[PDB]
């Protein structure tokens, strides 16, 4: 059903790529390590690695992470008392100019979901967007999250070009999951969440890097449920994105989906930019 095409490492204007970012919902740092997720990171050797759903505070990080080759500048965020839940990481070869946590809004800054790293020519945000939950019990909260998050990003983008990556917990369009018709009332494919996402692209503004390059390409997913061995049948969802400011599009080389990389129920995604 899907074969990600070869890595295009030069820009439309012929500039070689200078930055490789990789994002990955790891479904628990210790499970991911146990499943050889680190081995794959060493093969990708990104300039910056963003991790979501670490399920782990900084006080309890596995030693294998301290010894991650290349990525020495590491920033970690998690719920401060609740183990086994949410949590994000941002790991970089180069030291950022500034690193901050959350979105400036007390209600939305308790669950370790957002890290912002500022560099010379752009700002990188990684996020683990709140799931709407079984029975949509968190859908109202998610809509409030979506609005606060959008305003925050609009604010960052007014100063510097922006890259947002992570598990944004939404499949934008019907092409972004295998079973759109069965999922219109479920977390990840409700009109409210799909609308929030659409308005995010238009308000900041941001472009969906993968869909911009591959507008008609179906069956490209980043998440498959362990349930019923969905991955072996490619019954999945694209929940993981690189969204970028329109000003960065001339710098865009490729946006990749590493379908075969094991370690989680999500696969990694990888961006090439010529900055
Ligand atoms: Mg998970």
Residue numbers in the entry: 44 to 318
Please, what does the article write about this entry?
Mammalian apurinic/apyrimidinic (AP) endonuclease 1 (APE1) is required for the repair of abasic sites and other DNA lesions and is an essential element of the base-excision repair (BER) and strand-break repair pathways. APE1 hydrolyzes the phosphodiester bond at abasic sites, producing 5′-deoxyribose phosphate (dRP) and the 3′-OH primer needed for repair synthesis, and is the major AP endonuclease in mammalian cells. APE1 also mediates the repair of single-strand and double-strand breaks by removing 3′-blocking groups (fragmented sugar moieties), again giving a 3′-OH for subsequent repair. APE1 possesses a remarkable degree of catalytic power and Mg2+ is an essential cofactor.
Here, we report the crystal structure of human APE1 solved at 1.92 Å resolution with a single Mg2+ ion bound in the active site. A construct of human APE1 that lacks the 38 N-terminal residues, APE1ΔN38, was crystallized under neutral pH conditions by sitting-drop vapor diffusion (at 22°C). The crystals belonged to the monoclinic space group C2, with three molecules per asymmetric unit. While some residues within the structured catalytic domain are absent in previously reported structures of DNA-free APE1, electron density is observed for all residues from Leu44 to the C-terminus (Leu318) in the structure reported here. The same octahedral metal-coordination geometry and ligands are observed in all three active sites of the asymmetric unit. The observation that DNA-free APE1 binds a single Mg2+ ion at the A site (Asp70 and Glu96) and that a second Mg2+ ion does not bind at the B site is consistent with the results of two previous NMR studies. One of the two residues that directly coordinate the Mg2+ ion, Glu96, is strictly conserved in the DNase I superfamily, while the other, Asp70, seems to be restricted to mammalian APE1. The carboxylate of Asp308 binds two of the four inner-sphere water molecules of Mg2+. The coordination mechanism for Mg2+ observed in the new structure differs substantially from that observed for Sm3+ and Pb2+ in previous structures of DNA-free APE1. Our structure (1.9 Å resolution) and previously determined structures of free APE1 (except for the two-Pb2+ structure) contain a water molecule at the ‘B’ site of the DNA-free enzyme and a second Mg2+ is not observed in the recently determined structure of the EP complex (2.4 Å resolution). Together, these observations argue against the idea that Mg2+ binds to both the A and B sites or that a single Mg2+ moves from the A site in the free enzyme to the B site in the ES complex to activate the water nucleophile and then back to the A site in the EP complex.
